[PDB]
Amino acid sequence: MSAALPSIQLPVDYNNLFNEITDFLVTFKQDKGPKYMAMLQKVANRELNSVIIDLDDILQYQNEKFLQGTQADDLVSAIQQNANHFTELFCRAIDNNMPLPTKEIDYKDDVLDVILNQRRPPNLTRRYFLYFKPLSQNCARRYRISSKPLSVRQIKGDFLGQLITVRGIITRVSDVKPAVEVIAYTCDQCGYEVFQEVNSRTFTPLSECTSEECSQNQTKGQLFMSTRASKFSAFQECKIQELSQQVPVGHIPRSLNIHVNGTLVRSLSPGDIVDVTGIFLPAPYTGFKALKAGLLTETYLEAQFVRQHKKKFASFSLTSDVEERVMELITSGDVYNRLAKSIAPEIYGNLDVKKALLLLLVGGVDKRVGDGMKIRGDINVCLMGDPGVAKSQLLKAICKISPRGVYTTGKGSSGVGLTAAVMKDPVTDEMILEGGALVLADNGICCIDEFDKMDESDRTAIHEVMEQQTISISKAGINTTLNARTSILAAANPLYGRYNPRLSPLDNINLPAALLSRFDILFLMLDIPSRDDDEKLAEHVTYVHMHNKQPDLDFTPVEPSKMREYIAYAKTKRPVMSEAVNDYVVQAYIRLRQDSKREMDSKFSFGQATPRTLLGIIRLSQALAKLRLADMVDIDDVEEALRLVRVSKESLYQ
Amino acid sequence: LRIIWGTNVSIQECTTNFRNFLMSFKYKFRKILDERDEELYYIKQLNEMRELGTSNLNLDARNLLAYKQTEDLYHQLLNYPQEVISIMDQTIKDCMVSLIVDNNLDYDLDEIETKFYKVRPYNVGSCKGMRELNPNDIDKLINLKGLVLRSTPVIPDMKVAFFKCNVCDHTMAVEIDRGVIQEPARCERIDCNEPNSMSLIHNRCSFADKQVIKLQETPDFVPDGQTPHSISLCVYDELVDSCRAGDRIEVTGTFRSIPIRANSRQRVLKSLYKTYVDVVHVK
Numbered sequence A: 001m002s003a004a005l006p007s008i009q010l011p012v013d014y015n016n017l018f019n020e021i022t023d024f025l026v027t028f029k030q031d032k033g034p035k036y037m038a039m040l041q042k043v044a045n046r047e048l049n050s051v052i053i054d055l056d057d058i059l060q061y062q063n064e065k066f067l068q069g070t071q072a073d074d075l076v077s078a079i080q081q082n083a084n085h086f087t088e089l090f091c092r093a094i095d096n097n098m099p100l101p102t103k104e105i106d107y108k109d110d111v112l113d114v115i116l117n118q119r120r121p122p123n124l125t126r127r128y129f130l131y132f133k134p135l136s137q138n139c140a141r142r143y144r145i146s147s148k149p150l151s152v153r154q155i156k157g158d159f160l161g162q163l164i165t166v167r168g169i170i171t172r173v174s175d176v177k178p179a180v181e182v183i184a185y186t187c188d189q190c191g192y193e194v195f196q197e198v199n200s201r202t203f204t205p206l207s208e209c210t211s212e213e214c215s216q217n218q219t220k221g222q223l224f225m226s227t228r229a230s231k232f233s234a235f236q237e238c239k240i241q242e243l244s245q246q247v248p249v250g251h252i253p254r255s256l257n258i259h260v261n262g263t264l265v266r267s268l269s270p271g272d273i274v275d276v277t278g279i280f281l282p283a284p285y286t287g288f289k290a291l292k293a294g295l296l297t298e299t300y301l302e303a304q305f306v307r308q309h310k311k312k313f314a315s316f317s318l319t320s321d322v323e324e325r326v327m328e329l330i331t332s333g334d335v336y337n338r339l340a341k342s343i344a345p346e347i348y349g350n351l352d353v354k355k356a357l358l359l360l361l362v363g364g365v366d367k368r369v370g371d372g373m374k375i376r377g378d379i380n381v382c383l384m385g386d387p388g389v390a391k392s393q394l395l396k397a398i399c400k401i402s403p404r405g406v407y408t409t410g411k412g413s414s415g416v417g418l419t420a421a422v423m424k425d426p427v428t429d430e431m432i433l434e435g436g437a438l439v440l441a442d443n444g445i446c447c448i449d450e451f452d453k454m455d456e457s458d459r460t461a462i463h464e465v466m467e468q469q470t471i472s473i474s475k476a477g478i479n480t481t482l483n484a485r486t487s488i489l490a491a492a493n494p495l496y497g498r499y500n501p502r503l504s505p506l507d508n509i510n511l512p513a514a515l516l517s518r519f520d521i522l523f524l525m526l527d528i529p530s531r532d533d534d535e536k537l538a539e540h541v542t543y544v545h546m547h548n549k550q551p552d553l554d555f556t557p558v559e560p561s562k563m564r565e566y567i568a569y570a571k572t573k574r575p576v577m578s579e580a581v582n583d584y585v586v587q588a589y590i591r592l593r594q595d596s597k598r599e600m601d602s603k604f605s606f607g608q609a610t611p612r613t614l615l616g617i618i619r620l621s622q623a624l625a626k627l628r629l630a631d632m633v634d635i636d637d638v639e640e641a642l643r644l645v646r647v648s649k650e651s652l653y654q
Numbered sequence B: 001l002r003i004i005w006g007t008n009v010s011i012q013e014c015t016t017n018f019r020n021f022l023m024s025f026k027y028k029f030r031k032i033l034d035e036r037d038e039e040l041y042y043i044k045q046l047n048e049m050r051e052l053g054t055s056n057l058n059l060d061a062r063n064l065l066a067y068k069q070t071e072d073l074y075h076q077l078l079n080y081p082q083e084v085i086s087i088m089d090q091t092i093k094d095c096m097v098s099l100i101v102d103n104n105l106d107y108d109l110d111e112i113e114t115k116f117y118k119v120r121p122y123n124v125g126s127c128k129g130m131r132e133l134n135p136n137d138i139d140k141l142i143n144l145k146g147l148v149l150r151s152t153p154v155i156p157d158m159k160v161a162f163f164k165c166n167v168c169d170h171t172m173a174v175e176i177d178r179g180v181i182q183e184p185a186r187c188e189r190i191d192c193n194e195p196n197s198m199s200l201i202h203n204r205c206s207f208a209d210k211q212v213i214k215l216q217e218t219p220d221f222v223p224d225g226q227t228p229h230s231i232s233l234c235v236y237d238e239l240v241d242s243c244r245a246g247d248r249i250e251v252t253g254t255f256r257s258i259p260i261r262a263n264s265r266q267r268v269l270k271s272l273y274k275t276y277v278d279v280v281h282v283k
């Protein structure tokens, strides 16, 4: 019947496809030996589990063929299409030619390679996954595209399976789990194997003996399956949500799903900028069987590669250029106050507080008791002060630059959205939990605003957090003692908006010191006129509102990429405290204690300095040492600590 | 040479090396591990236990790591624990009666030949929770540390498939074959030939005991953004009524996989295999 399924043809030609590929797979020497083949030797060494695909190199071999006058025979123009077919062709091209194990197999190696060599479709002979990654357009513009960062909303239908890069944010991914690709069915009697293949969600097993010897047999002895011979590879899903600045006007953005497998499942965590790459693909759903017209499709996308403009702290390792970055950074000097200058220059002055935020980012130093306890190298900061003066530019710059960052309001969904949830998972029956604003943060930063407007509950929780990095819950299923490891930064205003200079900060302010004792730092940022300072204030404000570019100082404050770079490298040390500084610190503690107690029980008097004050002095001195990048402490730092401490409240006296 | 398919595990060589390590282990790990009187660390267990009639035994990993001839045994009990232990349960009776040869005894020999034996590797190489178990390393000796939430009741399982013929005053019997039953439809052709006449009774058959336990995982390290998980597993008979709510636990077992049905209605299954753990020992 040529009516159904009639003939038709295209320029696609698989015969040259395979030859082009497999010539490329071996002609690579431009960037051991043919390093692609050396990597294959590594694969023979069982060094990796997933092959890597660069594509500007494929462009470059097409350039080779071009420069030599050969029919370059472009496939990328096709591979950008229909990628799901190319995958089981590339795998065949490699299985065709895998080099030999330069090392020997032994009892201490992958337990799979032995079975490989014991029995030494083709899918179960594959000891290698593949995960692509597309070009960065910086190279596509070299010599002259296809896949730009795109939306949840801008699919346009026709982009099913075409090569693509989407940005957005991951809300919730389930846990990694295994899934068949090929069955291992063995015969009781024939002693031979059967390869039942599935690609669907589902199948129906093969029970009666259709074997090849049982074919020529009356009796049909039953077959069964394996738990190790049967191939496997994992399967995990993730949901993007759309970026704000690209939502059109008044429009509620929408959702999307992706599927991942195998190796790259560990490179995804919720809350981040991302550029997923891959291909958008269909699957079998039609709505739900009444609101239908046929041929309908639920759908998904393929994961093959992850880049994110936010580099977490545990991806740090030096090289022959980033160490140069840190060098030329440190070379200029004035590095400390330069940093605290470059922190959010959009807003004016108060270097003392920019510096305190920098130190909040440093956190401190972790120390373990070795007797069943540790103590946090962690910071908690506050900036009490009247309105009018800038307050929020700070927190937004913070969560702009710091990773693992979080903003919340004061009231609204503070009941549980700062806390642990309970939820069933889509892709698998299981009772998962995702947490509030805080728990998305850990070994990272938060920010809060209008603390005074929040509930007593948020106070009950944060009173735990600032000192102890746990959370305790006794509501339902969730009975945890959950780990936070977070760094608090709130803000609020006093009771009357502007200060009461005839009342104390201990009466003017709304919060109790039963909590605020935990607040190692506290600024009081209020405003009184002056004929001269506000002139150039307006100069600053007006020049920034004139063009976003900050004042044209002989100075270049620098990107947060480089800043998180330096923070991460300074997070690597763990310096030491001498006794020469210890004694001086002890004396300053006793000074401040007796002084503040006997003297400051009065007008401008806040409470009393504490052990926590001392512990914080210590942590911050450590951080200073971490910034100078020496493993010990100088006496030249504690002076800055206590300076900044008694400086925090200087404007209480004017 | 003797060897298993897809495997590098000898029975009798394992028995010999087992026996030689067993006759030779004298606080070696004090010596080779560290700087730290006594003699023949293990052998006292095996001398004492006989008069008390017990078919169990515990076992470290380090004492293999200490003795010379056990370094390769480590990676092999590791990979093939139920197989290496189907060996050692035999090597143990072998060593038993190779050690009784130097002794004359009252007739306790009516039992040990009828006996079984089993082992319990407890203090083993550390494992990092659950996330580590990408599918490369399924079905392997494993260790964990956490606490308890929920306990189930007893799963029984057919262990002797009794079978009542309908006629000829005859019973029938048949056992489980990698976890199934293939009812003999026939009627014992000789006496009577009715090729599908037979019945089934439960009150005859032999039942196993299995239990499942919900557990909360309590690592020593976690990644950036972590939170609890709740895992199920399977213990089997002679371990029941041991671990319950109110206990922290260090544990061992084997990580494994299994699919589930789509329904109570037909055999159509899931591409993704629910995971679990079978149990080897609890601390």
Ligand SMILES: Nc1ncnc2c1ncn2[C@@H]1O[C@H](COP(=O)(O)OP(=O)(O)O)[C@@H](O)[C@H]1O
Binding pocket: A347, A348, A387, A388, A389, A390, A391, A392, A393, A541
């Ligand atoms: N010192 C300043 N320089 C420039 N702009 C400022 C300054 N202080 C306040 N502002 C402006 O006024 C607003 C102050 O809001 P902010 O104080 O951050 O939040 P809230 O007043 O709710 O605590 C900001 O939008 C900011 O641009």
Ligand SMILES: [Zn+2]
Binding pocket: A187, A189, A190, A209, A210, A211, A212, A213, A214, A215, A220, A221
């Ligand atoms: Zn057969």
Ligand SMILES: [Zn+2]
Binding pocket: B165, B166, B167, B168, B169, B170, B187, B188, B191, B192
């Ligand atoms: Zn009968």
